[PDB]
Write a protein that binds this DNA or RNA. Structure first.
Lengths: 1048, 97
RNA sequence: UGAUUUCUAUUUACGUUUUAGUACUCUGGAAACAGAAUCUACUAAAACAAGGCAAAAUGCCGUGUUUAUCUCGUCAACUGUUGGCGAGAUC
């Protein structure tokens, strides 16, 4: 039960934990929990396919309902036939003559199939054919000023020969007019009720609105407007009764703006912060008068200079980032009536209307039903507003409370949240045994960091359960957002390092030595300052620098005592005397003193001109050099430590707040802290714990252990206690008695490798892998294929070739030059193939010869025709591969002459049996699972057939079953299961646990295939099942013979 | 002994540096903003009342004739008013005054 | 060394393939058309992750998240054997 300093490293695929003894500094344990990287693309695809299924089913059911209606009024029977009925001709004929029952109902069904668009406003950008949907419908309707849709369709069919395509886009209003005229004249001969005509018109021009949602029985649906509204906004994380506000509300905008304002620091003879009256004057005279605020306006507001102002949020380029007033200025540019624009409740209601309502007429009617002073034409102008989406973190009640607290004090959101220490009240943390994991779900985080937080939280839960409540917990979160952002950063790092290496090679070729490679830091610093010291402005020659650097020291601008910043933005290559006279001082606190060189105004001019010069000075460094504040105060140390030592990112902030709140609710005195990444990077560098990391998963634990030691150091020195009291937000009694002063004290307390060897030489790590057992995964590949059975008995898959008139599509030339017998026109249309080959031999110079042919002649290829009236070729079918594994769907297609299949049956698991002393196994594919109402059942018939496939006897003693990453042990060697490679050959694919096999081969520079395939047959000694904890402790597994069939 | 070691004219006042130096210790006090009414009237009695950084403590120099900026260092009892004349031009060189 | 966006709702016009018709081509032919292939196009009906619900319905679910195995079992769903919430146990 020994108290330990728990250390966590949270990444996108790993959670590394390190348990270190509190008072002896020895390593108790260290492990890594692994998990696949979550991705929003999977959910996005599932949602898109669900919507597509909804659309298809709705259209089919609408057609079935029209069919039932026609069967009611005897417009059809169960014996009719419409084989030869072309619905277009009969539909244009119904406008002027009599239609038979068979001719009528076909036109009615063909109308009910494609019925146009109700609201032209909502449209996607899925137009490769360069045509706006709204614009296409408008042009068609302009061509329909004196025509019905049936007339236009049939005349286009008679003129060109095409009806379907991107030109058949109409709006429902016009189809409804045509159907109404048809019913009008057609009513005379067939007995049709007025209510029947109304029912058909309803079935034609009715669609679900975006607020009704799905019907009854759907778990995603609702009952009325209140339920949909509550579901869209969601309950507040703090207030269960009050729902969240819109992201672009008025109160939320003002809250963010005042947070920005309270983050200000102004060098004036008055208070350096912002007072109440000044803030209100700013809101009225600057924020309410200009849409996008600038630093210049806020500067000239209070009679100060923009250059004297510091501490403002920045954009990517270097411009100030101040919160703009969205709703206020979007309304003021329509009406300046003070009663309408000023009333905060009216603007909040307008925001809530514009956000959750999107169709123009509904916005109009629900602003009209917001009874107030609001006029009517103002509603007309407001309806056409754009860009009101998003949901705010907190509710409007908490918004107003924090708004009062922000107006009256000088704190920001961080400081207010740390002060009042409000607890998440969704799930009560008091009568909950373990850490609540559902609290992470309410937070608005990406599923990647959400999964990582759930995993880290459950790891902390297991650690607490198996070892007791800790004393100190420390957590570091990775810089990478996803894998692609990590790759962006890696690419930029390699590119910048290559450029610095090439510049260093140029310098070394200039002077001549290997001496330039060792001076990198200094030489780059000098480079960013045009060979000039900053404290004294004396010239720093590069030749002298290469020769004898010892007089040119890399001084830290803000002392390491308080700043903790060791980044590139905190170094200045200076004369030795300037550094010797600087000491534990800031350039503001030194340059104006006696010991220093040239005064501070000249330096300010030089550094502000250098910051504007070619971006050679970072914004952080520019703020560092001009720190005119007293670092001896507590506020400045708090700011520095919170910025460059604590993870101020919202994700780590929320994880911290959750852990601290749960620990404080149960009155369990446990201190948790978060640490900045660059600080741990400097530690790992100067410790030389491991300069290069290629050993494998173990690295993820290592850093954790490291930061644990970091927390250790923050307990072993009374001087550092202040930092320990800031990294945890623990109340400190004006104390300021103990401190760390000389930067050499920083070097001694931090750089000194205390207990580093025991962290290096550890060889008893642990590893835990994640098991994905959820069935109903991706079953089959989505694309659908046809097959042709050639003279060779093997069946052949037909692949299609699209877009024959692009410019970078040489696939047709490739197919004609490699082996033309793969094309189908070779065997079934040799004349057109000869014409195509002539064109190919004609235009070898161009990449796609057919495109150049079409651009030079204006006619894309025509089929061979005696009268030269053949059709157009747009896609070409060509042979592919054999048909080894496939899902046959011939039963769905009627009397097909070719078998229709889909490819790549995705496997789900595999069950290992032992028959008469030889090991066999049955691969359960994802198709073999039926989803009966959240009850997943393995098909007994298909499973028995799969058993029969391997000739598995009945007396075969069932050994075990294996899902993804369920640990297996064969012949005595332990591996993790990647999955079935080729079930027909009794092969599985496994991998190592402590390292990827690719890296295991890259360590020894082996060129063997980086994947391990094992064969399960008589050539196998034993097969055993092994799992692991969520901490990494290995365990055997009772088979529970009779493998799992039912899945909840 | 208190020496006026460096001065810098600002828009609304003067930045002052004062070294209180005993036999073996030099304590540097930086006053970022001193009102112009106190500077132009040689009101050296109001030095400490203005806000200042914590004193930087170092070993005492042998003498305090000339600092790095070449300004002539004067004693605080002589007043900043005379310092304003000592090196007005040298201060004009480096943009303070 | 250099700062939050999840979940969900509506609809359109495409696309893939089968069947049928037509156009195109190729056999015996003045012709009717007798006949072969389904390459290349147009139109219509239908299927479009396997399937499972439901009974005239602006009908529903099916590629997302959590996923440490298996025990005594209390109390539960159920077409008999798995899921909370606990006690427990691992070559």
């Amino acid at each position: 039960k020994r108290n330990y300093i728990l250390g966590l490293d949270i990444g996108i695929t790993s959670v590394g934990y390190g348990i270190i003894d509190y008072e002896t500094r020895d390593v108790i344990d260290a492990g890594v929990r692994l998990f696949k990287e979550a991705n929003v693309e999977n959910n996005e695809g599932r949602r898109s396919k669900r919507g597509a299924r909804r659309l298809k089913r709705r259209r089919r059911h609408r057609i079935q309902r029209v069919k039932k209606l026609l069967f009611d009024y005897n417009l059809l029977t169960d014996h009719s036939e419409l084989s030869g009925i072309n619905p277009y001709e009969a539909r244009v004929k119904g406008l002027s003559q009599k239609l038979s029952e068979e001719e009528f109902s076909a036109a009615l069904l063909h109308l009910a199939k494609r019925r146009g668009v109700h609201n032209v406003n909502e449209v996607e950008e899925d137009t490769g054919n360069e045509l706006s949907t709204k614009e296409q419908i408008s042009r068609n309707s302009k061509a329909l000023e004196e025509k019905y849709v049936a007339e236009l369709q049939l005349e286009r069919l008679k003129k060109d020969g095409e009806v379907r395509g991107s030109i058949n886009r109409f709006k429902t209003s016009d189809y409804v007019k045509e159907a109404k005229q048809l019913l009008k004249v057609q009513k005379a001969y067939h007995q049709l009720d007025q209510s029947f005509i109304d029912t058909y018109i309803d079935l034609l021009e009715t669609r679900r609105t975006y607020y009704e949602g799905p019907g009854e029985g759907s778990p995603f649906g609702w009952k009325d407007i209140k339920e949909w509204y509550e579901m869209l906004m969601g309950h507040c994380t703090y207030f269960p009764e009050e729902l969240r506000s819109v992201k672009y509300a008025y109160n939320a905008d003002l809250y963010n703006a005042l947070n920005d304002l309270n983050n200000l620091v102004i060098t004036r003879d008055e208070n350096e912060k912002l007072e109440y009256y000044e803030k209100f004057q700013i809101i009225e005279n600057v924020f309410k008068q200009k849409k996008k605020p600038t630093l210049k306006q806020i500067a000239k507001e209070i009679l100060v200079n923009e250059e004297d102002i510091k501490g403002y949020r920045v954009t990517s380029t270097g411009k100030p980032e101040f919160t703009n007033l969205k709703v206020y200025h979007d309304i003021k540019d329509i009406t300046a009536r003070k009663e309408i624009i000023e009333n905060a409740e009216l603007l909040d209601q307008i925001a809530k209307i514009l956000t959750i309502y999107q169709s123009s007429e509904d916005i109009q009617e629900e602003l009209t039903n917001l009874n107030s002073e609001l006029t009517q034409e103002e509603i007309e102008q407001i309806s056409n507003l754009k860009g009101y989406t998003g949901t705010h973190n907190l509710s409007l009640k908490a918004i107003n409370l924090i708004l009062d607290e922000l107006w009256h004090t000088n704190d920001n959101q961080i400081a207010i949240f740390n002060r009042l220490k409000l607890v998440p009240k969704k799930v009560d943390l008091s009568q909950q045994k373990e850490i609540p994991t559902t609290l992470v779900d309410d937070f608005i985080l990406s599923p990647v960091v959400k999964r990582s937080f759930i995993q880290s939280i459950k790891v902390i839960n297991a650690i607490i359960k198996k070892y007791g409540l800790p004393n100190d917990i420390i957590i570091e979160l990775a810089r990478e957002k996803n894998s692609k952002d990590a790759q962006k950063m890696i690419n930029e790092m390699q590119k910048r390092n290559r450029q610095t290496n090439e510049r260093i090679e140029e310098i070394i070729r200039t002077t001549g030595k290997e001496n330039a490679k060792y001076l990198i830091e200094k030489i780059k610093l000098h480079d960013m300052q045009e060979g000039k010291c900053l404290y004294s402005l004396e010239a720093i020659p590069l030749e002298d620098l290469l020769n004898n650097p010892f007089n040119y020291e890399v001084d830290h601008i803000i002392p390491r005592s308080v700043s903790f910043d060791n980044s590139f933005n905190n170094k200045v290559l200076v004369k030795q005397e300037e550094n010797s006279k600087k000491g534990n001082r800031t350039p503001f606190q030194y340059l104006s003193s006696s010991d220093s060189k040239i005064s501070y105004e000249t330096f300010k001019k030089h550094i502000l001109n250098l910051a504007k010069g070619k971006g050679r000075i970072s914004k952080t460094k520019k703020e560092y050099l001009l720190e005119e504040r007293d670092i001896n105060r507590f506020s400045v140390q708090k700011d520095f430590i919170n910025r460059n030592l604590v993870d101020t990112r919202y994700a780590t902030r929320g994880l911290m707040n959750l852990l601290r709140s749960y620990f404080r609710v149960n009155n369990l005195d446990v201190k948790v802290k978060s640490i900045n990444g660059g600080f741990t990077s400097f530690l790992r560098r100067k410790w030389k714990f491991k300069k290069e990391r290629n050993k494998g998963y173990k690295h993820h634990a290592e850093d954790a252990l490291i930061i644990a030691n970091a927390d250790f150091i923050f307990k072993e020195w009374k001087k550092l206690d202040k930092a320990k009291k800031v990294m945890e937000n623990q109340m400190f009694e004006a104390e300021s008695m103990p401190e760390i002063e000389t930067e050499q004290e920083y070097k001694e307390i931090f750089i000194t490798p205390h207990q580093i060897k025991h962290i290096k030489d550890f060889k008893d790590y642990k590893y835990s892998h994640r098991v994905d057992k959820k069935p109903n995964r991706e079953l089959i590949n989505d694309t659908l294929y046809s097959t042709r059975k050639d003279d060779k008995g093997n069946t052949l898959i037909v692949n299609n070739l699209n877009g024959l008139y692009d410019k970078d599509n040489d696939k047709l030339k490739k197919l004609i030059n490699k082996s033309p017998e793969k094309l189908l026109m070779y065997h079934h249309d040799p004349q057109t193939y000869q014409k195509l080959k002539l064109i190919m031999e004609q235009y070898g110079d161009e990449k796609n010869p057919l495109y150049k042919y079409y651009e030079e002649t204006g006619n894309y290829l025509t089929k061979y025709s005696k009268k030269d009236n053949g059709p157009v070729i747009k896609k070409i079918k060509y042979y592919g591969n054999k048909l080894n594994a496939h899902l046959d769907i011939t039963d769905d297609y009627p009397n097909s002459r070719n078998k229709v299949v889909k490819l790549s049956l995705k496997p789900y698991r595999f069950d290992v049996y032992l028959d008469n002393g030889v090991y066999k196994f049955v691969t359960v594919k994802n198709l073999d699972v039926i989803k009966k109402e959240n009850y997943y059942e393995v098909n007994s018939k298909c499973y028995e057939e799969a058993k029969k496939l391997k000739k598995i006897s009945n007396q075969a003693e069932f050994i075990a079953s294996f899902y993804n990453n369920d640990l297996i042990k064969i012949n005595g060697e332990l591996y993790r299961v990647i999955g079935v490679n080729n079930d027909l050959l009794n092969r599985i694919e496994v991998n190592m646990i402590d390292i990827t096999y690719r890296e295991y081969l890259e360590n020894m520079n082996d060129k063997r295939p980086p994947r391990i395939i094992k064969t399960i047959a008589s050539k196998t000694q034993s097969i055993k099942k092994y799992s692991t904890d969520i901490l990494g402790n290995l365990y055997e597994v009772k088979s529970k013979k009779h493998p799992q069939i039912i899945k909840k | 002994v208190k020496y006026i070691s460096n001065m810098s004219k600002q828009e609304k006042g003067y930045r002052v540096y004062v070294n209180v130096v005993n036999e073996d210790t030099d304590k540097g006090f930086l006053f970022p903003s001193v009102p112009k009414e106190v500077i132009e009237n040689d009101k050296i009695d109001e030095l400490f009342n203005f806000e200042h950084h914590k004193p930087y403590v170092q070993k005492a120099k042998s003498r305090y004739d000339k600092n790095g900026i070449g300004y002539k260092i004067v004693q605080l009892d002589e007043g900043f008013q005379k310092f304003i004349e000592l090196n007005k031009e040298k201060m004009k060189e480096n943009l303070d005054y």
